[PDB]
Structures are given as C-alpha cells and as structure tokens.
Design an enzyme around this catalytic site. Structure first.
Site, mmCIF file in Angstrom:
data_model
loop_
_atom_site.group_PDB
_atom_site.id
_atom_site.type_symbol
_atom_site.label_atom_id
_atom_site.label_comp_id
_atom_site.label_asym_id
_atom_site.label_seq_id
_atom_site.Cartn_x
_atom_site.Cartn_y
_atom_site.Cartn_z
ATOM 1 N N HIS A 1 -0.674 -12.540 -2.771
ATOM 2 C CA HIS A 1 -1.729 -13.388 -2.195
ATOM 3 C C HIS A 1 -1.275 -14.835 -2.013
ATOM 4 C CE1 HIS A 1 -5.003 -10.148 -3.194
ATOM 5 N NE2 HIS A 1 -4.079 -9.741 -2.308
ATOM 6 N N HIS B 1 0.764 -1.259 0.000
ATOM 7 C CA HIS B 1 0.000 0.000 0.000
ATOM 8 C C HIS B 1 0.784 1.290 0.000
ATOM 9 C CE1 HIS B 1 -4.282 -1.663 1.086
ATOM 10 N NE2 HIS B 1 -3.625 -2.543 0.397
HETATM 11 C C1 HEM Z 1 -5.988 -6.245 -7.679
HETATM 12 C C2 HEM Z 1 -5.131 -5.909 -6.754
HETATM 13 C C3 HEM Z 1 -5.397 -6.250 -5.348
HETATM 14 C C4 HEM Z 1 -6.519 -6.286 -4.652
HETATM 15 C C5 HEM Z 1 -7.987 -5.901 -5.051
HETATM 16 C C6 HEM Z 1 -6.127 -6.637 -3.301
HETATM 17 C C7 HEM Z 1 -7.082 -6.767 -2.207
HETATM 18 C C8 HEM Z 1 -6.716 -7.061 -0.905
HETATM 19 C C9 HEM Z 1 -7.601 -7.100 0.241
HETATM 20 C C10 HEM Z 1 -9.068 -6.759 0.137
HETATM 21 C C11 HEM Z 1 -6.934 -7.585 1.280
HETATM 22 C C12 HEM Z 1 -7.467 -7.739 2.675
HETATM 23 C C13 HEM Z 1 -7.189 -6.576 3.651
HETATM 24 C C14 HEM Z 1 -7.734 -7.060 4.992
HETATM 25 O O1 HEM Z 1 -8.963 -7.327 5.125
HETATM 26 O O2 HEM Z 1 -6.861 -7.268 5.875
HETATM 27 C C15 HEM Z 1 -5.573 -7.797 0.798
HETATM 28 C C16 HEM Z 1 -4.607 -8.409 1.590
HETATM 29 C C17 HEM Z 1 -3.251 -8.608 1.257
HETATM 30 N N1 HEM Z 1 -2.730 -8.286 -0.043
HETATM 31 FE FE1 HEM Z 1 -3.810 -7.709 -1.652
HETATM 32 N N2 HEM Z 1 -4.845 -6.989 -3.236
HETATM 33 C C18 HEM Z 1 -4.336 -6.616 -4.441
HETATM 34 C C19 HEM Z 1 -2.994 -6.645 -4.778
HETATM 35 C C20 HEM Z 1 -1.973 -6.938 -3.901
HETATM 36 C C21 HEM Z 1 -0.576 -6.861 -4.284
HETATM 37 C C22 HEM Z 1 0.069 -6.328 -5.556
HETATM 38 C C23 HEM Z 1 0.132 -7.321 -3.204
HETATM 39 C C24 HEM Z 1 1.617 -7.449 -2.918
HETATM 40 C C25 HEM Z 1 2.506 -7.741 -3.805
HETATM 41 C C26 HEM Z 1 -0.811 -7.707 -2.182
HETATM 42 C C27 HEM Z 1 -0.434 -8.302 -0.972
HETATM 43 C C28 HEM Z 1 -1.424 -8.601 0.074
HETATM 44 C C29 HEM Z 1 -1.162 -9.346 1.303
HETATM 45 C C30 HEM Z 1 0.167 -9.869 1.628
HETATM 46 C C31 HEM Z 1 -2.287 -9.378 2.035
HETATM 47 C C32 HEM Z 1 -2.549 -9.989 3.398
HETATM 48 C C33 HEM Z 1 -2.537 -9.061 4.481
HETATM 49 C C34 HEM Z 1 -2.553 -9.722 5.833
HETATM 50 O O3 HEM Z 1 -2.082 -10.896 5.912
HETATM 51 O O4 HEM Z 1 -2.816 -9.055 6.881
HETATM 52 N N3 HEM Z 1 -2.091 -7.611 -2.724
HETATM 53 N N4 HEM Z 1 -5.466 -7.648 -0.578
#
Ligand code: HEM
Ligand code: HEM
Ligand SMILES: [Cl-]
Ligand SMILES: [Cl-]
Ligand code: NA
Ligand code: NA
Lengths: 713, 713
Positions: free
Chosen positions: A244, A77
């Site tokens: 993810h 972010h």
């Molecule tokens: C289309 C693009 C993306 C969408 C719509 C998206 C959406 C989200 C959402 C909704 C969450 C949950 C937040 C929560 O409820 O804690 C999240 C978590 C996360 N995202 Fe994404 N994401 C995107 C791209 C990315 C990218 C590019 C990365 C990193 C390279 C990323 C890494 C993560 C990780 C590691 C988590 C887990 C967080 C946790 O374990 O607390 N995501 N993502």
C-alpha cells in the site's frame, strides 16, 4: 442434463485424482518447461515488461500513467490464495487464469491486468509460463517504481485446468459469517483448511470483520489469515504497508453498475468481465472493490509515506462513493495526487485494515519501528515479497534462472548439499542385508519408510523423505508415526549407518535419509520373498540429512497427518467421512486411483497400520506381499455390518455360519462399495493378477519414495 | 464444497473430453484386450456359466432353481440403453456396472446378477471383460434352456469410469411426463436423443403410458422407443415375446419395503442395493419391478407357450401385491408353476406391454404368424438377439472368437473384403501429385475428406471413410456435404482412380475410399506448402468401397451431421447452444480439447466451412495451413459485438477505427471466451507455435482419417 453428482451428491469424487492428464495438456508428453525457461532471454522479457508499465491501453487506462500498482496487486493475488493447512492455492500453477479464481470478486479487474500481458506471453511463448509471468511482472513493477527486489526464480509450469480446491461451502459470493454454511464457529474460529474470511476474498474484508469497521477486530482476522498463509507479524506488516505504498483502490460509483464476472459474461466479452455502466466504466471512473483510497503522495514511486501518513494523522470514518467504509485524515490538506486530472488533489485516506497496523498493539510496535527505521522496512518487505511469491515452489532445487537468491531461507525447509561419493549398488545390497539381519521386521521397515516419505504434498512440494526430518522434532513425536516404535527403528538404523560409514574410505558415507528409504525397500523385498516371489525394488541414493536448526518446528506442524488412510489412521472424529480424507491424501501424494488402490491393499498386508490394528488386514500371511486384501475384500461369502459400539467400524462374518472373519473401517470397505473403486479392486483380486499386483505395488512404492527428489529431475 | 458447476451452471463442460485417461485405467499402457480374449478358453467359460445357471446362492435364491431368466434380463438391459440418435448407451462398454445405470430403477436386482458372475470373472481375469461376460451369460442362459443362438462375438473392452450420457433433464426417478423437465412435447413426441419414456427406464413403462394400462396406447410407446433403438416391428415382437418366454417378474409385496439403490446404499452393502424389508427380502419374497407375472408353463425352457397363452385366453385387469397394474387370464386353470413351492400353481398372467403384441393391429399380424410358425419366431428372435447385443460393437473386424456368425448383415454397414495388392508409398506419392495436378483445390480436397471421415462416432463405432459411402445415398445428398460441390470432386477423383487402376499390373488397385482420404492428405500437404512448410501427412491404405445394395439408407440417417462446428455448420436452430454441440461432436470423434482446438483452427483457414462462409475465417491467406485463426482471434485490437440481425453471429471491428475486420459464430468465439479453451488457443497463437501447430494439426487430421480403421488394430 441430470448428472451422477445430482443423483448421489454424497458419493466420493475420484475425478480429482485424474486431473492434469496428458489428455487436457496441449504440450507434448516430453515437454519440459524447465528446459524451455533456461533458454529464455529473461533480460529481454524484463525490458518488455518495463516498457509495458507506462504503455496505457484505452480499454483500461493506466492510473497515474503507470500500471505498476495494478500489477503488484495481480501478483500478490496470485500468491495470496495459498493455505498452509494443505499447501493448495498460491502462484505456482497460474490458477488465477482459470475458474473460479479468475472470477473471485477480490480478483475483479485483474482480468484486465492479465490481458495487458498477452502480447509479452505471445512473444516468448512456451519459454515463459503464465505462472512465472504473473510473478515476474510484479517484480518488474516494484523495480520500475524504485524498489529493489530480493530476487526471482522461474520454474512454475503452467497447468491447463482448474485445480480442485475446497474454498468453502457457502453458495453466495462474499457471504458474511453465521450462515447455513458458515466457515466460522465458536470464538471466531476459521474452519481448516480455509485461510480467508469470506468466499471470494484473498484474506480479509478491507472494511473490517463482516463489514464492521473496527481496526482492532480487523487485526485479529489479518493475523489469523496471514498465519494460515505462513506469515508472522513482521512479515504481515511489511507486506501490507509495502504493498500500500503503491497505487490506489477503485470505487468511483455504486457497485450496482458492475456487471457479470468473467465466467458469467457473454461470449463477446472474450474472457473479460465486470463491465461497468458507471460513466466511462474505466480509468477515472473505475470500480473494483468499491473503496476509493489512495495511500501516498507518490503512488508510482517507492517512498516512506505510508507510515508517515498512518501515524501523522488522526482518522475519521467515512464512506466511499459506492457506500463502503473507509477512513480520511482529519484536518489534512489535499496532498495526494489524482490518477487522471492534474488539477485535482485529495486528502490522505486509509482502509480499516491499514489502520489495524497502528491500533493493534503488536502491529503498532512493528509499524513504529518501520517508520523510524525505513531501511528495516524495505529489507523486511523485500524478503517477505520473495517468500510470498515462492512459498509454494518447493525445494530450492526447483528454482530456475539467473536471479535466484543465494541466501538459504528457513522456510524453504533446506537440505544440505551432498559433498561425498554416494553408495553404489554393491553398497546398497550390503546395507539391505545388514538391515534384514538386525531383526527389524517387514512391518517396522515398511511403516518407517512410509512415515518418512508420505509427508510429501504436491500442492506446495513440501515434505518427503529427503532431509531425514522424521528423526527431528516435531515429526518424531507425531502420533501417526508411532513415536516409541519409530525410536527403536531409528536407533537400529543409526547404528548400521555409523558402522558402515566408519568402515569406509575415500569420503563415502550414507545419509540416514537414504538408509531409512533403503531399509523400507529391503522390507518390501523381504515381504515379496515371504510370498515366494524374487523382486528387486529400485532405490536412488542422494538424500541428505537436515539439522534441527534447519527444521522450523511450527511450519512443520501443518504437515502432520491427522488422517492417513494408508495406515488406517484417524486422529480424531471429523465431519468429513474418512474415505473423502483418503482421496484427499492420495491427491496430495499425486496418486491416481489405481495407484491409491494397489498401494493401500499392499500396505494393509505388510503391517503398515498404526498400532498394528487388524482393521483391513485381510490376510492369514501378514508381512507377505500378496493380493490377499483384494481377494478377501471381494469374497461374497462374507457379509458386513457396522458395529453397535462404533458405526465407522464394520465386522465381516461368514454368511452361512455367522462366524467373525475380519474387521474394517470405512477406508477399507469403500474399495468394496464405490463402483469405480470396486472395479479397480476386482482387477487386483482376480486369479491372474498376483504378479501384476506385486509389480504395480513396487512401482507406486518407488514413486512415493522419490516424490521430493527434485535433485534427480 | 461449492464447485465451478455450482457457480456457473451454464458454462461449457470440457471434462467429457478428458475421460478415459491412462490415469484412471488400471491396465498397463500396452494392454491389448483383443490379444487376451483370443487366448481365452471360451468353451471352458461357457461350461462354468452353464453350471452356474442351476447353482443357487442363498443370498439371492434362483427362481425355479434356474438363474437363466434373471441373466437374460441382465443382458437385455446391458444392451437396452442404446439410442441410434447418438449411438450412446448399449452393452459395448459394460456401463451397467457404473453410475448411473447400476442404480437405474429398471436395473433393480441386476446388481445381484452381476455379483453371481464375480467368481467366473475372477477365475478368467483380464481375458474376459465384464462387457463381454454380461452378453455371454445371456447367451449361455438361452442355450441352457434349449434355445439356439445366432452366435456371439467377443471384443468389448472394459471401461473404468462412467460415460457422460444425457439421459434426460428430470430430477426425480421415473417422473411421469408433463413435468417441468418433460421429455415429451406436442403429440407425445419424445425429445432427441432419448429412447425411453421415463428417467430410469430401459424403454417403456410395463403398466402402460405414464401408468395407464391401455395396451393399444402402450404399443405406440413400444414402437417409438424400439425404433429409436434400431429395431423394427418384427424384431420388436420377436424380442419381447422371446424374452418373456423365460422367467418371471417380482412384486411379492409393497414397494415401500425396498430400500436405497446401490449408489445411495450404505458402505456395508458392498455395492449391492434395493435391500428389502418384505419377509425374507429375496426368493419367494422378491420385489424388483412391483409386478408379479409369470408368463409360461415352463419358465426354464424355450417353448411357444407365450403366444399360446397370449392368444388362447382373454385377459382381465388386476393388481399385483404391490399395487401395480397387470393382467390375468379369465377362467383359467392354475397351470403356471410357482418359483419355490412345488405344491402351488398359478393362473397365466401378462403385462400391459405384452398385450400390446396382440391388440396393436400391426403387432398382431406378426404375433399370429409367430404363433402359427414357431420356427419363424425362433429364427427372428435369434437374429434380433444378436443384433441387440452387438449393435454398438462396430465394424465386423472388431468381432472376436470362434462363434462369430459368418452371415453378413445389412445393419453392420458391411465393408467388402480386399482381394488385391495395396498401393505402396511411391504409388501414394504419385496419386497425391495427380490429385494436385487435376486442379482440385485445397478447400475442395480438405472439405471432401473431412465430410467422408467425420461421420464416425465412437459411441457405437459407426461411420467413417471406409466404404466410400459418401458417394452413395443418403450421404451424397446431405446438406452439410454440399451435394453439387461434392459430386464435382468425386467425378474428378473417380477419373484419377480409373486411370491409375487401368495402368496397373499384378492386380494392384486403389479404392475410391482410399483415394478420397489420400486426396485430403494431398490438400493438407499443399496447404502446408502454401505456408512455406514441407510436410508429409501419413496415409494408410486398405479401405474398400461398399455398394448401395450393402447400405441401409434409413439406418444411415442418424449419422447425418445436423451440427458440425468443424465446418461452422448448423442445419437449423436448436435449443442447445452451438458450442455445446461442438463439444458433443468432439466427444463422438474421440477428440481431446487440445485436439478439437487445433483441428478447428486449421479447418477454418483451409476453407472447410460449408457454403464458403467467411465466419471464423480469420486469415488473409486462406488455403495456407497457418495459426492465423488463433493469432487473429486473440488480438485485443479487435472488439466483438453480436449483430442486430442475428445474436449468434458476431462482428469483429478494429477497436480504434470501427473498421469491420471479421465475422464469427459462437463456435468461433468460444475459443476466445471459455477460460480453458482460450488457454489452449493461446499456445497455438504464440509466436513460437507455427511448427507445433502444423505438426499437431497433421496428427489430428490423420487420427480422424483412421477412426474406423479397425482392420489395422
Ligand atoms: C490485509 C491485507 C490486505 C487487504 C485487506 C488489501 C485490500 C486491498 C483492496 C481492497 C484494494 C483495492 C482493489 C481495487 O479497488 O482496485 C487493494 C489494492 C492494492 N493492494 Fe492490497 N490489501 C491487502 C494486502 C496487500 C498486500 C500484501 C499487497 C502486496 C504486497 C497489496 C498490494 C496492493 C496494491 C499494490 C494495490 C493497488 C492496486 C492498484 O493500484 O490498482 N495489498 N488492496
Ligand atoms: C416393452 C419391452 C419390455 C418391457 C416393458 C419389459 C418389462 C419387464 C419387467 C417389468 C420385468 C420384471 C422385472 C422384475 O420384476 O424382476 C421383466 C422381466 C424380464 N424381461 Fe422384459 N420387458 C421388455 C422387453 C424385454 C426384452 C426385449 C427381453 C429380452 C429379449 C426381456 C426379457 C426379460 C426376462 C427374461 C425377464 C425375466 C427376468 C427374471 O426371470 O428374473 N424383456 N420385463
Ligand atoms: Cl491449487
Ligand atoms: Cl455410453
Ligand atoms: Na499450492
Ligand atoms: Na454406445
């Protein structure tokens, strides 16, 4: 308290040019962050970060006992606000810790992530900025969980107040499209310079476009927003699937349990927000996005399980415990671990936007190739992660520390190393005389150098005269650059260069990038001479010439000026008034209001206008460096009226006879209208100001010529 | 573009502390206005102003062939925004030329007056500021018309952006009292710090209170507003009747003919506003206030005709051509000249507020005395005009040029001349050691110096430690100053002073004003030494001690701190949150946000709180100069909640055990809440910051000690 903004909500705002003063900065005027970072024990900081990953705090307990996923999301972010259109947003200023981004709904509970990092921040102090720390923590998170990164550079100096970024016009968080301030029009066309689909999101809506859970339509939003953040299909799939691979989302109960964001919270919350009334309000009961998805069977370890799940199941639409749309694997066993209870397991789940990676036909092909060739996936994700987190850092000369990758990447807009003696002062004098004897005019020399140097923007530190990219595609064909005029100047300068270089000994040679700049300096000197003043303009050699193969033509397109008030240029008709575009340009150039004012008034009289327009050319001695713009603009003997043909062009007539004396645009006349700008114009238009004008003009000219000169930092 | 202020309209605004940066100033870093002014040929400026008075421009023709009345009104309005409650407003920064004042309805057509002065401004350039020129013009107006002024001082340096002043909460110009944002409550009680009856007026409504044409009731508004601008009855009558000796009002047709104010006007209007569709829109047809009154039979000459008319006729209520309430002389002949047609004459007329000067019983006595003794009137008016136009200029030491009146006036808060050698560095060392040997504590020494120096306000440059007025009424009895504690400190210091001065030769002596400051310096040095750090705090002697007889006790009342966050002090319960009052205080002290932050954190641990409150005292080594405030505030091991008894007092408890560690106010905990201030607190709370904290603390202490030291300018 009713403010000037309340009374005159449409007057121009100059405060954006005076941000980041020495007043708001707690560090001394001589603090140099690069020097502090270079002395940091980076290895020690990484050890501490590694320890932190599994040191759970009871006020925000670690999922699966490991904060790595939370941290990767925090880093993603931080970088993810970046827009190619203006270079604004990104990780490079640590702006996640200030308003509004610290309270964007997509940044919920990243306040907890940053607060977990305070003890390390405090321990190392000024030697590691928050901006670098946020990224370094993401890298360490990856490394701790088994993923080898491509590298890391420090050098992101902290900032001390919010940047003024246009994030959209909506007045409601997360407003869906089609409202009174819609960022969409036409066939789902996102307004420039925005790179996200809703106010308060990083890129797209995880449920689908405007909440409609269609993976195919979601894919189109993903492609558009990611391309507006400088990422292509391969990079986009690598980043989403890579990210993810780790962690989980949080949506354990209804969203209505979640209270005020940090900038709205009570003083006792001590800078945190989103306090939740749902059960324990944290940990197993966390609510962040409202979705409840955990992607892999090992969320704290790098795996190839994301694409095994994506392709190995068929997917059914369902709802989270908060009511949000998400997907669950049909007929699956409970194989995914619970974050807190070892006796619970869960079926595989996915977001709409994850399914985009399979149901969009172009993404599907990449996804399949990644599934079949996991080493290709890993390499692509590592490269893309590096690009994501460094895309706003500027030239490689700004990269600091022991982990900078040696590999030169195309998106860095690379400049070759200089491997020969540079021209000295006697050489510069000889080259300036040659340029002035060639017949090139003041107007041509100033215009060309201006065109070369003024592509710089301080938002992502792209552009500027280093590289001589003005001679390459696409800059040489930009309308603002006057392609036919430009070609003729460059042919003349290339011939000077060739003749000088061919007469040298000892390896000495001048770059075309340096000569373009030097030639502009000669024009300014000649213009001063034309006005009876003996002036010397500073020049620093050392620029090198980049090749066409080192110049990505599609990435360069966003640097094209469609508005440049300094050349009285506007490519088309825009909703934003041209004086607002001038101030925006001045901010990107790092100019104060006084600097913008003196620069524009001097460029007008030197002949820098596109097409030789007479608009704002308020002098009878064009090509002479005088303060005539200001003296004539402020003459109450002239009355001004918009023309019948064009309300954005104004005619200045003698008040007593009605005779036409001048024409001007909004950019010209704003200096006689806006009460702060006119106060600046009056200083330069006073009878004691000719020498001040000249010396302030040379200073700001030189500033612009050097904006990209991080080799001299 | 949606801004942080839109999203979080109640968060604290720090930008008022970062105005006036070197970024927005067009003059070089070394520009010194006083040095420029001192070489101005002030006689030549005055001759040009004198010629201007009768040189009419056709775009705003001069009434009666003479601009004198227009210019007097211009000068009076430049000065007339002053409020004694905060010292804000006044002529001293030339703020009439910026928003919002440039567009206040009461300032209508003073844009023309300022435009008339541009040729003179332009001719003399940086050697006469706009701020000074506006006042000088009104003096030359008076002089050209046969009135002997009291004198004139230069030295008002120009400013380059609007001041942030609270002018009221109304969202409509000129709103009548009683609305949703009324500035009145109770029995016609004007809210502090306001000094005018409606948004966009200088003092009062010329028709009468909220438009009711009752002179008796109008008199009450006149007395209250003028008292809040530091004027008493004699001075009020002298100023109103003096000013209305000259010129005329303008109300030739309906007000609906007048268009946008300058900040709302089109770019072609080049900074002017109020363009009128009524006939020629100017001259004989002008509309400014909507009233049409000409006071005397010789509007371009000083006379005693105002009072001859006021008392020699009876008055009838009537309406102007724009429909405003005004008064005409019953049975009178047409004896008043017309402004443009020498064949027309008019009956005497008056405003409601002029008739206040005869129908209010207290005003009537002074007005009759002035009528019978016009030499008394002339002298009162000249003194009051000087006071009006200089009241915000600060100590007499800032007064420049050849026409400064020699007479010392009580309203100047005068400081006697020093007529003896000053203490040297070795004497200062001897005195610091004696102070420390007396048994006075760090807390006592710090608190007393703070109390003495921190009455300064940069708005009108009143207050500070010079004068040693802390020992006099009323400062010595202010609750914030802890009267009994203060008396004990001052007795001890006076004994030291007496002993040192009695041992000297050669006339050398130290003032008590100097010794109070020096003693505070010794406390700060001793606190540093208590923390293991040797520092010398800079000290500049040369303050002198004023007498009680040279101190106006009623005028000093507005300087009482009723809120002083730096001592965690709030005299009563206010509607404005205490953190907002802290930032207001910081602005008045001329502090940046970093300066405010360091200063507060250090004062907390030195024992400077009023009453020895433990609120914010986040240290176990009180009276040692450390960064403990910041380290402890920022420790995530402590959880904060508002108390049951008092929602503005908070308890910090160990998060794990519940044990009580600290108590704090809003002023203490905003540093751990507000995202910009927390970023600052983090720098000083870092493990590398002890040296930095001490050095920055000493620097801002010294800055506060020297705020009124214009003898060293
Ligand atoms: C289309 C693009 C993306 C969408 C719509 C998206 C959406 C989200 C959402 C909704 C969450 C949950 C937040 C929560 O409820 O804690 C999240 C978590 C996360 N995202 Fe994404 N994401 C995107 C791209 C990315 C990218 C590019 C990365 C990193 C390279 C990323 C890494 C993560 C990780 C590691 C988590 C887990 C967080 C946790 O374990 O607390 N995501 N993502
Ligand atoms: C109760 C206090 C006052 C009231 C309500 C008041 C009201 C006004 C108004 C309504 C006008 C006419 C504006 C226009 O239509 O052009 C004006 C004009 C003027 N006032 Fe006052 N005034 C006050 C005090 C003062 C003071 C203290 C002075 C100066 C010492 C001053 C000097 C002038 C002059 C010289 C004019 C004539 C301007 C011209 O000839 O263009 N007035 N006054
Ligand atoms: Cl930004
Ligand atoms: Cl002010
Ligand atoms: Na950026
Ligand atoms: Na003031």
């Amino acid at each position: 308290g009713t403010s000037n903004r309340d009374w005159w909500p449409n007057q121009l705002d100059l405060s954006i040019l005076h941000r980041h003063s020495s007043l708001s900065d707690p560090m001394g005027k001589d603090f140099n962050y690069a020097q502090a970072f270079e002395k940091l024990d980076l290895a020690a900081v990484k050890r501490d970060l590694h320890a932190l990953m599994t040191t759970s705090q009871d006020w925000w307990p670690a999922d699966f006992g490991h904060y790595g996923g939370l941290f990767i999301r925090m880093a993603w972010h931080s970088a993810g606000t970046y827009r190619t259109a203006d270079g604004r947003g990104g990780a490079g200023e640590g702006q996640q810790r200030f308003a509004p981004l610290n309270s964007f709904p997509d940044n919920a509970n990243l306040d907890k992530a940053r607060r977990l990092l305070w003890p390390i921040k405090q321990k190392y102090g000024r030697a590691i900025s928050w901006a670098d720390l946020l990224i370094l923590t993401g890298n360490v998170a990856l490394e701790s969980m088994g993923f080898k990164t491509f590298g890391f550079a420090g050098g992101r100096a902290d900032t001390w107040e919010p940047e003024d970024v246009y994030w959209g016009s909506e007045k409601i968080w997360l407003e869906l499209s089609g409202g009174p301030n819609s960022r969409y029009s036409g066939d789902r066309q996102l307004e420039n310079p925005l790179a996200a689909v809703q106010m308060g999101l990083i890129y797209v809506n995880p449920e689908g476009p405007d909440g409609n859970p269609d993976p195919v339509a979601a894919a189109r939003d993903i492609r558009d927003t990611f391309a507006r953040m400088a990422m292509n299909d391969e990079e986009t799939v690598a980043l989403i699937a890579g990210g993810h691979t780790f962690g989980k989302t949080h949506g354990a109960g209804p969203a209505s349990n979640v209270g005020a964001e940090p900038e709205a919270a009570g003083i006792e919350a001590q800078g945190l927000g989103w306090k939740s009334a749902y059960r324990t309000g944290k940990g197993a009961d966390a609510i962040t996005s409202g979705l409840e998805v955990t992607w892999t069977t090992t969320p704290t370890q790098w795996s190839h399980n994301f694409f095994e799940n994506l392709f190995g199941y068929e997917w059914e639409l369902t709802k989270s415990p908060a009511g949000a749309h998400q997907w669950v694997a049909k007929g699956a066993d409970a194989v995914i671990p619970d974050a807190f209870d070892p006796s619970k397991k869960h079926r595989p789940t996915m977001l709409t936007t994850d399914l985009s990676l399979r149901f969009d036909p172009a993404y599907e092909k990449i996804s399949r190739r990644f599934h079949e060739n996991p080493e290709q996936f890993a390499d692509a994700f590592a490269r893309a992660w590096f690009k994501l987190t460094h895309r706003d850092m500027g030239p490689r000369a700004r990269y600091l520390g022991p982990e900078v990758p040696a590999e030169v990447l195309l998106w860095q807009d690379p400049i070759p190393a200089v491997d020969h003696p540079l021209i000295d002062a006697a050489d510069a004098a000889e080259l300036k005389a040659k340029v002035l004897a060639s017949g090139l005019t003041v107007s041509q020399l100033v215009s060309t150098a201006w065109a070369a140097a003024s592509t710089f923007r301080g938002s992502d530190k792209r552009g500027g005269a280093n590289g001589a990219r003005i001679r390459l595609a696409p800059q040489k064909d930009w309308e603002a650059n006057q392609p036919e005029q430009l070609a003729a100047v460059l042919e003349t300068l290339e011939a000077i260069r060739t003749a000088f270089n061919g007469a040298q000994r000892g390896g000495k040679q001048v770059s075309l990038a340096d000569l373009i700049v030097l030639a502009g300096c000669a024009g300014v000197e000649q213009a001063a001479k034309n006005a009876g003043h003996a002036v010397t303009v500073p020049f620093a050699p050392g620029r090198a010439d980049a090749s066409q193969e080192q110049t990505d033509v599609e990435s360069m397109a966003v640097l094209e000026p469609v508005a440049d008030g300094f050349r009285n240029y506007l490519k088309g008709k825009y909703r934003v008034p041209a004086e607002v575009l001038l101030v925006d340009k001045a901010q990107l150039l790092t100019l104060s209001a006084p600097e913008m004012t003196v620069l524009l008034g001097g460029l007008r009289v030197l002949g820098a206008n596109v097409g030789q327009s007479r608009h704002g050319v308020f002098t009878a001695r064009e090509q002479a460096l005088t303060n005539d713009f200001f003296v004539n603009l402020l003459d109450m003997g002239t009355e001004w009226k918009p023309t019948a043909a064009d309300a954005d062009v104004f005619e200045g007539r003698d008040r007593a006879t009605g005779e036409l004396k001048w024409t001007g645009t909004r950019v010209d006349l704003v200096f006689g209208s806006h009460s702060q700008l006119r106060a600046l114009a009056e200083v330069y238009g006073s009878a004691d100001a000719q020498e001040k004008f000249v010396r302030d003009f040379v200073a700001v000219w030189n500033k612009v010529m050097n904006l990209d000169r991080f080799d001299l930092a």
